[PDB]
Amino acid sequence: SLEIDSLARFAVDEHNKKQNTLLEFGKVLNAKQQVVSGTVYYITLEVTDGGKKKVYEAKIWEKPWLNFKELQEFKLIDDAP
Amino acid sequence: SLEIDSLARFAVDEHNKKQNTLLEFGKVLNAKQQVVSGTVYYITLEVTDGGKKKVYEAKIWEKPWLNFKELQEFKLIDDAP
Numbered sequence: 642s643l644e645i646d647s648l649a650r651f652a653v654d655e656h657n658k659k660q661n662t663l664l665e666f667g668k669v670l671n672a673k674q675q676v677v678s679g680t681v682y683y684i685t686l687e688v689t690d691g692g693k694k695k696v697y698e699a700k701i702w703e704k705p706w707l708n709f710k711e712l713q714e715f716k717l718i719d720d721a722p
Numbered sequence: 723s724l725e726i727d728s729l730a731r732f733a734v735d736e737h738n739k740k741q742n743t744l745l746e747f748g749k750v751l752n753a754k755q756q757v758v759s760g761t762v763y764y765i766t767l768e769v770t771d772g773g774k775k776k777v778y779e780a781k782i783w784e785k786p787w788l789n790f791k792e793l794q795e796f797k798l799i800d801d802a803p
């Protein structure tokens with residue numbers, strides 16, 4: 642199973658296309674393949690701290706059938722809503 | 723948005739635990755869900771340009787049943803393999 646070869650040269654073909662670098666392809670060295678499932682939720686929410694109200698952004702990730710709740714992000718959107 | 727409010731409280735909680743802040747919930751202002759399905763690829767590979775050889779980090783995210791391939795990372799690892 643060497644689809645890994647296609648992705649490697651193609652990865653050089655896009656750095657060939659992105660940047661103007663003419664790199665020749667040697668061979669695949671190491672590989673790591675992990676299929677990602679689930680359903681990601683972006684939540685914009687209103688919250689309170691020190692009496693003042695703030696607005697944050699929360700990127701939550703789930704694998705609901707495996708009892709997985711993981712929080713990837715908690716950015717601060719608005720200091721003064 | 724009745725039990726995604728339930729997941730909005732998740733975010734503020736695991737924030738406070740991970741972050742030691744004291745945010746108290748308010749309400750959700752907006753939310754968009756994104757079901758994800760695909761395969762990701764981490765490949766080190768050997769490259770050649772200008773004579774001597776190199777090795778590159780390559781992050782590759784593809785959705786195989788659409789033949790779509792997305793090249794994300796391509797960071798130079800070392801100029802010595």
